[PDB]
């Protein structure tokens, strides 16, 4: 009947190792979504940079001609 007491130990031990992997799952998911969030922000800038640059291409030509 001591084995019954041993089980409560191994039950706690196993459950308490299980706690770590659960948290480990939470940590992995957290990193990915911040990147999803963060990278979502970065690709929103990609249009804006396209709009800038193309306008500068015109305004390069325009200013260079205008001042001459």
């Amino acid at each position: 009947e001591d084995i019954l007491a041993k089980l409560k130990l191994r039950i706690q031990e196993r459950d308490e190792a299980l706690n770590f992997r659960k948290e480990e799952k939470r940590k992995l998911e957290q990193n990915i979504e911040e990147n999803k969030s963060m990278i979502a922000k970065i690709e929103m800038e990609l249009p804006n940079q396209s709009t800038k640059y193309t306008m500068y291409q015109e305004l390069r030509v325009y200013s260079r001609s205008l001042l001459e």
Binding site: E13, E16, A17, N19, F20, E23
Partner: protein
């Protein structure tokens, strides 16, 4: 010794190089057969390809005693010696025994019992060195933990069990509860050294197959491709990687080297354990990196180890990126210069202070045969034994009533929460009690610290934890509620703030001494060593989620914890290691370079020895937006009368540019200075304290301003200077009229990298037609805007060809961003280092 094999005597005994050997011809006699002891060699008959006989190894009793006496010598030579120095000698002795004898040791049970005895003795030498005559306060983790985690890094050959209890860790939940976490023997070193049988048979096949792989290299006359051997690299009794040893054009001539290293015993008084090998001829015959990594795993991983240490008291967020300080000045130098045996042993104690402090929650754990509960004065710490230096170390942490100062701060920080929730909790008032100053560390009993009076009573829950999200909230009604806040300083045996908060609550609420003004309240507990928090008691509606939220906010930002945390860190010595478009913005920015400032030339003499002559140099200060260049020549007269010249040269670089900056109007002074050598940041900082508006940044990109000395307009000008004159230049030879600053800037970088590679090929590139000239009012040859592009392409190809030659890579493998970054000198070398 004479040993005789016959039809009567079947064991052919012999004893060579310390290996006691018994041969049994198993084709003849059958007393033992193919038993899987590790240390039995199988004698393959070479012509019949049969296991005709077995050889049983042992370590001979002569070399047992040579080993035993080496451990005795280490124990005798202890005294005032650091624990690291002791175990470094143990490790060296143990590696020496093991890497020599290998599988002979494990067949020699009388050695293994000795190895257990010696290892335990080294441990006990450390235990008694910390005045701790008991097992419990010294569990395995203190010794075997690798020494970059501040353990001793002891190696083992014992079946040293790691207690299953000692692997747990705990982390604070945001809910205010605590989750325990987790992830057997400590590893024997023996499994990490390849046994000699495997080494020999693998050495035959490896060097045999190398001859075939060289026959391919011979047949094709190709380069001996190391890619053909990368699986073989750490094989062979001579390690095959010694074939590529850069010294090997000499090591071919060091003949008779093995006997030479043995006769050193008559020449050098210091015994050498690796007398039998030489890393340049044998190669390194063992590699123990896997032992270090696996040892962390056996001890529970970094999170499981660090609970045994005061790390959680630092409240660093993570272990990675932390480092341990060393300097050797004052630690060792002053003891060499000004020895005094009774006093200067306190300097040798500096690592032991750090070590004992670091392992405090283990070495001062309450689980003891005896000890005493010596409470530290003015403090809640208990000092269960007279551990030599932990007492003074902890006093310096909690100096000047820090224990009380913490407790009052958390009590009043709670007041500043209650003062803003009165109506929501239906509180008529909250009282900070007249807490007696002892109360913060009188551990045997307590008062209420904060008292709540209801507006018209609340219903009140049965006693429960802050982690218990559900409550029997209709159990009773009461209109007075108390909070008791109790600090704690845990140890690895006891830092569970959940069970602590319960047990102290249940005790005090039944104890007669407890000055509690109501039958219902909570006890709040804080483990100040682990930064854990908890609460237990009765709860009225809205109280539990407030304390849960409020307590975390306190732990995150309270100032009294911060001064404690810094004191722990400053005691542990343990510290944390913590743009291309910007150059052309409307600010004023100077690049500065110090590499050309102090220069020395070498020549032969009539004495045959060389001698050093200093020569004139220059500080190089360049504005990349405007192209303006300030070339402050530094003349050899400033080195006269001094000998610490290199540090003086660093000081004089920062000083002379500060003198220039201080003379110029603030509308022309920089606002950022970008410095091409990180060693120059700090003398500039201490010199530019008078101008806080200037930010100073390390360049991190590499700009080769050292190469400008190859330009004759600079070389002769700087060499032939008679005084430390200033010379002003512009590197943009009118380019800012016809091209932009960036391409003009990039052109300078292309030209500078070019002449750093080769001036003359650059001059060839800069002279595409022989009719081109350099005008005296210019620095570069006069070229058209398209001709400048043509020479830029030649410089770009020249840079990449030199890069490709230096790295064995095709230029066509490089993208437009990579070739740019190569021009910027960024760290492109391998993907494993970015």
């Amino acid at each position: 010794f004479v040993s005789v094999y016959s039809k009567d005597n079947p064991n052919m005994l012999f004893d060579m190089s310390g290996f006691e050997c018994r041969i049994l011809p198993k084709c003849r006699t059958a007393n033992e057969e193919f038993v899987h002891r590790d240390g039995v060699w199988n004698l393959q008959n070479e012509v019949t390809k049969e296991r005709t006989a077995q050889c049983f190894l042992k370590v001979d009793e002569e070399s047992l005693s040579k080993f035993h006496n080496r451990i005795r010598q280490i124990l005798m030579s202890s005294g005032s010696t650091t624990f690291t120095k002791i175990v470094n000698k143990w490790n060296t002795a143990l590696i020496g025994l093991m890497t020599y004898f290998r599988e002979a040791v494990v067949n020699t049970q009388e050695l293994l019992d000795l190895l257990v005895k010696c290892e335990n003795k080294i441990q006990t030498r450390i235990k008694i060195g910390l005045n701790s005559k008991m097992p419990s306060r010294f569990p395995p983790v203190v010794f075997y933990t690798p020494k970059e985690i501040g353990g001793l890094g002891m190696l083992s050959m014992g079946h040293v069990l790691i207690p299953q209890s000692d692997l747990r860790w705990m982390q604070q939940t945001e809910a205010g509860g605590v989750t325990h976490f987790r992830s057997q023997l400590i590893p024997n070193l023996y499994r990490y050294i390849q046994p000699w049988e495997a080494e020999f048979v693998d050495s035959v096949r490896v060097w045999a197959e190398y001859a075939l792989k060289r026959q391919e290299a011979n047949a094709q006359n190709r380069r001996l491709t190391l890619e053909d051997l990368d699986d073989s690299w750490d094989r062979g009794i001579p390690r095959i990687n010694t074939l590529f040893q850069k010294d090997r054009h000499t090591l071919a001539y060091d003949k008779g080297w093995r006997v030479r290293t043995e006769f050193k015993a008559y020449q050098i008084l210091k015994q050498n354990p690796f007398w039998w090998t030489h890393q340049r001829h044998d190669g390194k015959l063992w590699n123990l990196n896997n032992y270090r990594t696996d040892m962390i795993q056996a001890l529970g991983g970094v999170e499981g180890i660090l609970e045994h240490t005061l790390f959680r008291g630092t409240y660093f967020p993570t272990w990675e990126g932390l480092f341990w300080e060393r300097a050797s000045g004052f630690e060792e130098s002053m003891k060499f210069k000004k020895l005094t045996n009774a006093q200067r042993s306190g300097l040798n104690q500096i690592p032991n202070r750090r070590f004992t402090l670091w392992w405090s929650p283990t070495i001062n754990r309450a689980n003891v045969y005896v000890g005493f509960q010596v409470q530290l004065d003015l403090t809640g710490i208990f000092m269960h034994g007279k551990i030599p230096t932990l007492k003074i170390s902890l006093i310096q942490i909690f100096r000047a009533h820090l224990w009380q100062k913490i407790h009052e701060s958390v009590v009043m920080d709670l007041c500043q929460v209650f003062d803003q929730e009165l109506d929501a909790l239906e509180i008529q008032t909250v009282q900070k009690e007249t807490i007696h100053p002892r109360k913060s560390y009188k551990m045997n009993s307590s008062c209420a610290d904060v008292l709540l009076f209801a507006q018209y009573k609340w219903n009140v829950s049965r006693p429960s934890l802050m982690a218990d999200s559900k409550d029997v909230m209709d159990n009773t009604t009461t209109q007075k509620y108390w909070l008791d806040v109790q600090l704690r300083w845990g140890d690895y045996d006891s830092h569970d703030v959940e069970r602590y908060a319960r047990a102290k609550f249940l005790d005090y609420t039944t104890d007669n001494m407890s000055i509690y003004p109501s039958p219902t309240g909570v006890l709040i507990a804080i483990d100040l060593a682990y930064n854990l928090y908890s609460a237990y008691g009765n709860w009225f509606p809205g109280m539990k989620p407030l304390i849960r939220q409020a307590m975390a906010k306190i732990i995150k930002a309270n100032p009294a914890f911060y001064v404690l945390r810094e004191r722990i860190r400053k005691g542990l010595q343990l510290y944390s290691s913590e743009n291309y478009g910007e150059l052309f913005s409307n600010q004023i920015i100077w690049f500065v370079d110090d590499t050309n400032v102090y220069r020395v030339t070498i020549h032969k003499t009539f004495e045959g020895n060389l001698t050093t002559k200093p020569i004139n140099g220059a500080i190089f200060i360049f504005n990349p937006r405007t192209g303006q260049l300030f070339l402050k020549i530094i003349h050899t007269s400033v080195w006269a009368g001094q000998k610490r010249l290199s540090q003086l040269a660093k000081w004089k670089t920062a000083e002379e540019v500060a003198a220039l900056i201080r003379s110029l109007p603030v509308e022309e002074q920089p606002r950022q200075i970008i410095v091409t050598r990180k060693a120059m940041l700090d003398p500039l900082e201490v010199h530019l304290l008078d101008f806080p508006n200037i930010v100073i940044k390390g360049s991190e990109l590499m700009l080769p301003f050292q190469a400008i000395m190859k330009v004759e307009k600079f070389g002769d000008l700087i060499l032939k200077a008679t005084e430390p004159q200033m010379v002003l230049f512009n590197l943009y030879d009118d380019w800012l009229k016809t091209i932009s600053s960036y391409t003009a800037f990039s052109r300078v970088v292309l030209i500078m990298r070019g002449m750093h590679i080769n001036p003359d090929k650059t001059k060839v590139i800069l002279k595409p037609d022989k009719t081109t000239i350099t005008e005296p009012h210019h620095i570069w040859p006069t070229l058209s805007d398209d001709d400048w592009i043509k020479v830029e392409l030649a410089l770009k190809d020249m840079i990449l060809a030199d890069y490709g030659k230096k790295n064995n890579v095709n230029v066509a493998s490089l993208t437009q961003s990579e070739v740019r970054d190569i021009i910027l000198g960024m760290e492109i070398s391998a993907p494993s280092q970015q």
